[PDB]
Design a protein around this ligand. Structure first.
Ligand SMILES: NC(=O)c1ccc[n+]([C@@H]2O[C@H](COP(=O)([O-])OP(=O)(O)OC[C@H]3O[C@@H](n4cnc5c(N)ncnc54)[C@H](OP(=O)(O)O)[C@@H]3O)[C@@H](O)[C@H]2O)c1
Length: 163
């Protein structure tokens, strides 16, 4: 069951400020929608509270220690271990804590690199391309509504081989 990270981060790996995306970029929300519709998003509780409602047309799974959590349209899990039981293509959708927890465990990552420097208070963990093969790299198209340069990366973990 393919396990992927799904994230947008800026040139300094910022992913959030005051529990919201620091950028306004409609084409990347379209990207997220295209990739995850019909599949599963796993997210930590703050990320979920940030969006406020489940994203439509896909399974929303929320990781929390709160056994009181029960939101309509949302499935709850209480540990990381539960992620590996989830059927199908599972995307780790945030936030900083969950990415830190999962970056060493996922098969691959769909990263939108936001090609600017924003003020942030939450970050994606450092990673090196030494470890990740660029399966694809696609420059986002800019327009009136989408004015920050950005790049769609699909990265796949490199195998460790002798020599
Ligand atoms: N740029 C992007 O693509 C993107 C995408 C999504 C989110 N974000 C940003 O990320 C930020 C939030 O990140 P964050 O790290 O502060 O919060 P987070 O990871 O979204 O939520 C953390 C919460 O998840 C629960 N949790 C995490 N690990 C757990 C475990 N092993 N077992 C049980 N529960 C666990 C805990 O909830 P309880 O405290 O309820 O137990 C924890 O407080 C927001 O600013 C958001 O905008 C960015």
């Amino acid at each position: 069951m393919t396990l992927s990270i799904l994230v947008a981060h800026d040139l300094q790996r910022v992913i959030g400020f005051e529990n919201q995306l620091p950028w306004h970029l409609p084409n990347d929300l379209k990207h997220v929608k295209k990739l995850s519709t019909g599949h599963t998003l796993v997210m930590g509780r703050k990320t979920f509270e940030s969006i406020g409602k489940p994203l439509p047309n896909r399974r929303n799974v929320v990781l929390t220690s709160d056994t009181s959590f029960n939101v309509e349209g949302v499935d709850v899990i209480h540990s990381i271990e539960d992620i590996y039981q989830l059927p199908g293509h599972v995307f780790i959708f945030g936030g900083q804590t969950l990415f830190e927890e999962m970056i060493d465990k996922v098969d691959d990552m769909y990263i939108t690199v936001i090609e600017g420097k924003f003020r942030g208070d939450t970050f994606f963990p450092p990673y090196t391309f030494e470890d990740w093969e660029v399966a694809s790299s696609v420059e986002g198209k800019l327009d009136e509504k989408n004015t920050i340069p950005h790049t769609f990366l699909h990265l796949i973990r490199k195998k460790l081989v002798p020599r």
